[PDB]
Amino acid sequence: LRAIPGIAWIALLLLVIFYVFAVMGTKLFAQSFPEWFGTLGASMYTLFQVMTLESWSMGIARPVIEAYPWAWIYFVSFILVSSFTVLNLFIGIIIESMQSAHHAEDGERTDAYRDEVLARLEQIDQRLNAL
Amino acid sequence: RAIPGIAWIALLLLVIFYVFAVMGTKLFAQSFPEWFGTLGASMYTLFQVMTLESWSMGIARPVIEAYPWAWIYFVSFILVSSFTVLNLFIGIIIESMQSAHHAEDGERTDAYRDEVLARLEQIDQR
Amino acid sequence: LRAIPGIAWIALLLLVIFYVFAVMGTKLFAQSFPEWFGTLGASMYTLFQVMTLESWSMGIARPVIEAYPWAWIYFVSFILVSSFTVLNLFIGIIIESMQSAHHAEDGERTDAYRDEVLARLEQIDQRL
Amino acid sequence: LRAIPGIAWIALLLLVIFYVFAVMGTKLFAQSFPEWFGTLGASMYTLFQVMTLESWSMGIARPVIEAYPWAWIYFVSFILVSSFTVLNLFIGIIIESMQSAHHAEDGERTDAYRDEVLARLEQIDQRLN
Amino acid sequence: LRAIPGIAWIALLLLVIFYVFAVMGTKLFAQSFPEWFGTLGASMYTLFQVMTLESWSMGIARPVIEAYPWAWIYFVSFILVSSFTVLNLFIGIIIESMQSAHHAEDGERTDAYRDEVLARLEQIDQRLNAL
Amino acid sequence: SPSLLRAIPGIAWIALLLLVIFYVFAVMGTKLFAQSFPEWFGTLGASMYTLFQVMTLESWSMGIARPVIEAYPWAWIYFVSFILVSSFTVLNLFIGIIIESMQSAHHAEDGERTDAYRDEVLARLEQIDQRLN
Amino acid sequence: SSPSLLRAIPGIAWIALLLLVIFYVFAVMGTKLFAQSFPEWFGTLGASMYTLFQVMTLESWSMGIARPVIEAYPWAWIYFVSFILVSSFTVLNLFIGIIIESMQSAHHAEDGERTDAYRDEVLARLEQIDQRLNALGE
Amino acid sequence: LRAIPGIAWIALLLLVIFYVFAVMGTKLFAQSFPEWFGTLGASMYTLFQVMTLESWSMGIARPVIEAYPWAWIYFVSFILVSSFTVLNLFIGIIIESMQSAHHAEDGERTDAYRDEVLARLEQIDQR
Ligand SMILES: CCCCCCCCCCCC
Ligand SMILES: CCCCCCCCCCCC
Ligand SMILES: CCCCCCCCCCCC
Ligand SMILES: CCCCCCCCCCCC
Ligand SMILES: CCCCCCCC
């Protein structure tokens, strides 16, 4: 019933997410956006800032004011990462909790049926009066 | 259901929205007085076109006035209706009958517990 | 023992990820390669070909040999698509079949438990 | 049960970490780090050689660390490859074993319940009186 | 004639060069490179790998460019081992085989000399009968 | 160096430098493990003693190289030196002696056959002689 | 039997390798007593071979660099002599050994030609075997 | 035929041996005593002097042997120098002489055999 260890797996998939999409976003954010005018060792770091840290949400929303017609899916990058994570993580948690519940209750009913085992072998073998 | 997720499928559904909303509302926006400068009214327009009030097929036609360049909307309305119907209805059917199998057969086995105790009482009580 | 709408939305996700890497091929390298300079609407053509077709379009993924350390991700991208989708789909559906197998045989054993019911009855009144 | 898909998709993303840090260690550690002289396609071999073999390619590692301000991220590569190794190996093996254990053990104790069936059939047809 | 044991002789001597120069290398370069830095357990294995494998070994040899004039003699030492040893074994082969060739073939010629013996011993006695 | 003559004392020179090898390596390794070992309670002068011990004779002396297994971390290669020194002795000396023997065999035996041909020259004069007619 | 007829040359590698060693050896023996006295090189940590082959009669000026060994009479004379003795070993071995070995080949071929004079004696054997067989009369 | 300079080759290599053992002595046989008190490059001097000459460098030989286990090796150097020189010098001269011996001896006997040639043709051609 040990189904917890699927936890760190999501965080290392998060490593995958941040690598891929911070690299793409850091190319398109190093190209023209003047907030940093380039991010190689601080791409992870800038996206992680924008993730409701250092009060920097609208902070990133300004360099996309300097390119609005073709740069919005970067704040939507925040959105995408959040959604993908929350989805898989949350649903795994749900399934694990509910397996535990169902097995617990149904097993208790069946061990009452083992009490019925007790009843039976007390009935026949233990009260024969001739052996 | 594979390793996919329900609201994750729905997320890719509004990603489809991004796709074909952006395409359409970017291609012919500068030439039509229906949704003149269609920017955020794309999702609304289409997801409201789907079989709503039996009239939005009617609004799908005035863009059929641009058949060589505006039939992908026929394609796309078919897309959205298709995946909505399929996913929602049929997936919920299978979910419901899975839960049904479990609960139904469990309560039947509780009636079996009834059988057990009835017989054994008839033998033990005397 | 019922998971086929699974296959349905899996095909949907297939088309979605096809579009994803298509447009990624239309933006990251679009100006540098005149191979299909305007991939905006025919990265489909390019990548459909790249689909191990006639052993030459892994070839036509070559304009990634243009920038081999960084863009090798299109070849690796068909790798990823095939792996995740085909792998998970195929195996998981077969596993739903093995679920059905469990149900059938172990239910027959519980009808041997119906034989238990018989045992009950033939203990009750055989020996008043 | 015996699931292949997990380990398969793992192996893919594990190898994507491999090429990422191959690039990480082949562009900044080739033209001036001649331990691996012409490191463009050899980076695969260099990194996986650094992986815990005879305790001597970690010795190849340190003179690369001689460039300390810009030469740290590939034993960072070490820790990321360890990330994926931990995941696949540990989780797969342990959880799978105990799943199968649940199955078999519960079945066999129900067979003990069948010996109780034998008790009832003790006192129908063996003892009439 | 059959001196492949002598090949083993020369081979053992050149491997003596191998061992003793590995020991002298343990002496001069033990702490200087961090390449192995423990040149106490596997000095053999060290120079073993240094010997022309994947070209990564000359790359093993520069971490003791850490000591420029105090480790160059080992670059030329592996020159010594490789070239000297291979050339010695081919020396053995060439020279001693061709010595055997001399003896065999010129002995065949001297067996022709046996035949000339035969002809004149034919001319022993023929002048007693028809003369 | 084709000479077809007796070239054994070169191997003899190698053999006495092999005695020097005994001396050097055995006295190297015999002095730092003279304190911490119970066998001779000081190998200060037991190195050629270990010569006639561990030159692969009696089959128990690599058995006493085992007490060097007792000191594996920085003192392992020394019974490998045992193995070496044994190979030194056997191969070098034995090859020298073998080629010695074959040298002698060839040269002497074929010279004697030539002497036989000279008896034939005296025959050719058997007809340069009495049967002159 | 073909293509060499006593090519026992390649062992000349030995010579060259001795060369290297020799260089090293007595470079060190000049780096030991010197390398702290003279100001010229003033660190012979790796200048050993550089300076030694410079003093190998280069531009008629590195005997010019041998002047600072004239700066010390007894304790500094035998370095140019180092060079002479290196030349002794290497040149003697390679050239003169190869030449004398070829002249040993001359030994062999010369005595073989004498055996062809014994082919002359073959001439005489057939002077009698086939010629005066008394095939006339009597 | 006259491969003579090899002996000088061995002799110069012997000089190299002298240097090597000189520096080993310099390690042990420099300061273990006050008997030479510094030998950082003069073991050559003391060894050429001790080579059983003048009968007094053995008077040198004791105050180094004051440390009995750590000094007899220089006398063993006597032995090393001996072995090297004796073997190679002596037998090299011997071997060269032996080569010349075989050739001279039996080739000259075969010149006599040429006179044999003349005798046998004196019979077979004229009678
Ligand atoms: C943010 C990038 C997605 C937009 C890609 C172009 C969409 C318009 C396609 C027009 C095809 C004629
Ligand atoms: C739009 C129709 C697509 C049909 C794809 C069929 C795939 C069959 C896979 C066979 C695996 C058993
Ligand atoms: C990467 C480590 C390679 C170790 C090689 C050991 C020696 C193998 C000898 C094979 C001879 C053909
Ligand atoms: C081709 C696949 C053969 C089976 C692979 C098993 C992988 C086990 C990983 C254990 C890592 C220590
Ligand atoms: C949010 C957890 C961060 C853990 C540190 C990661 C260092 C690469």
Alpha-carbon distance C56 to C59, whole Å? 5
Nearest to B116 among A87, A102, A116 (CB): A116
- Residue D14: partners with Cβ closer than 8 Å, 6 or more residues away: D81, D84, D85, D88
**Which residues on chain D are in Cβ contact (under 8 Å) with E46?**
56
**Which residues on chain D are in Cβ contact (under 8 Å) with E49?**
56
Single-letter code of the amino acid located at H106: D
Instruction: Assess contact for D86 and A8: CB atoms under 8 A.
Output: yes
Query: Nearest CA of chain F to the CA of G21: how many Å?
Result: 20
**Which residues on chain F are in Cβ contact (under 8 Å) with E102?**
2
Distance set, CA H60 to CA H29, H53, H54, H55, H67 (Å) = 11, 12, 11, 10, 13
Distance of CA B49 to the CA centre of its chain: 15
Alpha-carbon distance F124 to E117, whole Å? 9
Count Cβ atoms below 10 Å from residue E75 Cβ, excluding itself: 15
- DSSP category for residue A6: G
Rounded to 5 degrees, φ, ψ at A7 are: -90, -60
At G11, list the tokens: 């062992």
Q: Which of F72, F79, F99 is nearest to F29 (CA)?
A: F79
- DSSP category for residue C1: -
Q: Which of B10, B3, B2, B8 is nearest to B86 (CA)?
A: B10
**Over the Cα atoms of chain A, what is R_g?**
29
Alpha-carbon distance A70 to A63, whole Å? 12
Instruction: Assess contact for F25 and F81: CB atoms under 8 A.
Output: yes
Whole-number Å distance, alpha carbon A13 to ligand 4 midpoint, is 21
Alpha-carbon distance C29 to C109, whole Å? 62
Environment class of residue D21 by beta-carbon count within 10 Å: exposed (0-12), middle (13-18) or buried (19+)?
buried
Output the CA torsion sign for E43, E49, E55, E59: negative
Nearest-CA residue for atom 7 of ligand 1: B23
Q: Which of H62, H70, H58 is nearest to H34 (CA)?
A: H62
- DSSP category for residue E25: H
CB contact under 8 Å between E6 and F99, yes or no, is: yes
Instruction: Assess contact for B46 and B80: CB atoms under 8 A.
Output: yes
At F10, list the tokens: 């070169």
DSSP letter for each residue of A98-113 = HHHHHHHHHHHHHHHH
Environment class of residue E36 by beta-carbon count within 10 Å: exposed (0-12), middle (13-18) or buried (19+)?
buried
Dihedral-angle region of residue D53 (phi above 0 means left; psi in -120 to 50 means alpha; beta otherwise): beta
Alpha-carbon distance B24 to B73, whole Å? 8
At B76, list the tokens: 């796309």
Does the Cβ of C40 fall within 6 Å of ligand 1? yes
Does the Cβ of B23 fall within 6 Å of ligand 1? yes
Nearest CA in chain G to E95: G8
**Does CATH place domain F11-120 in 3.40.1280.10?**
no
Q: Which of F87, F104, F109, F122 to mutate to test the interface with E (most CBs of E within 10 A)?
A: F87
- DSSP category for residue C66: G
CB contact under 8 Å between D34 and E60, yes or no, is: no
Question: Number of helices and strands (H, E) in chain B?
Answer: 5, 0
**Over the Cα atoms of chain H, what is R_g?**
27
Question: Number of helices and strands (H, E) in chain A?
Answer: 4, 0
Neighbours of chain F (3+ CB pairs under 8 A): E, G, H
DSSP letter for each residue of chain H = ----THHHHHHHHHHHHHHHHHHHHHHHTTTSSSSSS--TTTHHHHHHHHTT-TTTHHHHHHHHHTSGGGTTHHHHHHHHHHHHHIIIIIHHHHHHHHHHHHHHHHHHHHHHHHHHHHHHHHHHHH-
Q: Where are the domains of chain G?
A: 12-121
Rounded to 5 degrees, φ, ψ at G94 are: -60, -65
Instruction: Classify domain A7-116 at the CATH topology level.
Output: Helix Hairpins (1.10.287)
At H57, list the tokens: 């460098």
- DSSP category for residue A72: -
Instruction: Assess contact for G94 and G15: CB atoms under 8 A.
Output: yes
Single-letter code of the amino acid located at D85: T
Q: H/E element holding E79? A: helix E72-79
Whole-number Å distance, alpha carbon B36 to ligand 1 midpoint, is 19
Q: Which CATH class is domain B6-115?
A: mainly alpha
CA G71, G73, G77 angle in degrees (round to 5)?
A: 95
- Residue G106: partners with Cβ closer than 8 Å, 6 or more residues away: none
Q: H/E element holding E98? A: helix E85-122
Count Cβ atoms below 10 Å from residue H124 Cβ, excluding itself: 21
Give me the long-range contacts of F118-122 (CB less than 8 A, separation at least 24).
Answer: F118/H113, F120/E117, F120/E120, F120/E121, F121/H113, F121/H116, F121/H120
Q: Which of D46, D13, D8 is nearest to D27 (CA)?
A: D46
Whole-number Å distance, alpha carbon A1 to ligand 4 midpoint, is 24
User: Binding site annotation covers G113?
Assistant: no
Alpha-carbon distance G30 to B57, whole Å? 103
Alpha-carbon distance E73 to G24, whole Å? 9
- DSSP category for residue E69: T
Is A in contact with B (3 or more beta carbon pairs below 8 Å)? yes
CA F7, F10, F11 angle in degrees (round to 5)?
A: 100
Alpha-carbon distance F34 to F41, whole Å? 7
At F103, list the tokens: 């040298």
Instruction: Assess contact for A51 and A60: CB atoms under 8 A.
Output: no
Alpha-carbon distance E118 to C88, whole Å? 94
At A111, list the tokens: 């061990």
Neighbours of chain G (3+ CB pairs under 8 A): E, F, H
Alpha-carbon distance B47 to B77, whole Å? 8
Q: SS3 sequence, D17-71?
A: HHHHHHHHHHCCCCCCCHHHCCCCCCHHHHHHHHCCCCCCHHHHHHHHHCCHHHC
Environment class of residue C10 by beta-carbon count within 10 Å: exposed (0-12), middle (13-18) or buried (19+)?
buried
DSSP letter for each residue of A59-118 = HHHTTTTTT-TT--TTHHHHHHHHHHHHHHHHHHHHHHHHHHHHHHHHHHHHHHHHHHHH
In this structure, CATH architecture of domain G12-121: Orthogonal Bundle (1.10)
Distance of CA H31 to the CA centre of its chain: 31
A73 Cα nearest atom in ligand 1: 1
Alpha-carbon distance A29 to A47, whole Å? 11
CB contact under 8 Å between H120 and F118, yes or no, is: no
Environment class of residue B69 by beta-carbon count within 10 Å: exposed (0-12), middle (13-18) or buried (19+)?
exposed
How many residues are there in chain H?
A: 127
Whole-number Å distance, alpha carbon G48 to ligand 3 midpoint, is 38
Alpha-carbon distance G111 to G106, whole Å? 9
Nearest-CA residue for atom 11 of ligand 1: C41
Instruction: Assess contact for G92 and G12: CB atoms under 8 A.
Output: no
Give me the long-range contacts of D26-31 (CB less than 8 A, separation at least 24).
Answer: D26/C69, D27/C69, D28/D70, D28/D71, D29/D64, D29/D71, D29/D74
Rounded to 5 degrees, φ, ψ at H102 are: -55, -55
Expressed in angstroms, the distance from the first to the final Cα of chain H is 44
Q: SS3 sequence, chain F?
A: CCCCCCCCHHHHHHHHHHHHHHHHHHHHHHHHCCCCCCCCCCCCCCHHHHHHHHCCCCCCCHHHHHHHHCCCCCCCHHHHHHHHHHHHHHHHHHHHHHHHHHHHHHHHHHHHHHHHHHHHHHHHCCCCCCCCC
Helices in chain C by DSSP H: which ranges? 4-27, 43-50, 57-60, 68-71, 73-124
**Which residues on chain B are in Cβ contact (under 8 Å) with C13?**
4, 9, 12
Nearest to F127 among E41, E107, E123 (CB): E123
**Which residues on chain B are in Cβ contact (under 8 Å) with A88?**
5, 8
Instruction: Assess contact for H122 and G125: CB atoms under 8 A.
Output: no
Whole-number Å distance, alpha carbon A8 to ligand 5 midpoint, is 12
Residue with tokens 């190869």: G98
The widest CA-to-CA distance across chain A, in whole angstroms, is 100
Single-letter code of the amino acid located at C101: A
Alpha-carbon distance F56 to D80, whole Å? 52
Instruction: Assess contact for D1 and C95: CB atoms under 8 A.
Output: yes
Alpha-carbon distance H97 to H108, whole Å? 16
Nearest CA in chain F to E101: F2
Residue with tokens 């007085």: B33
Nearest to E37 among D45, D46, D59 (CB): D59
Nearest-CA residue for atom 10 of ligand 1: B23
Resolution for the entry shown, Å = 4.2
Does the Cβ of B102 fall within 6 Å of ligand 1? no
Alpha-carbon distance B5 to A92, whole Å? 10
Nearest CA in chain A to B4: A88
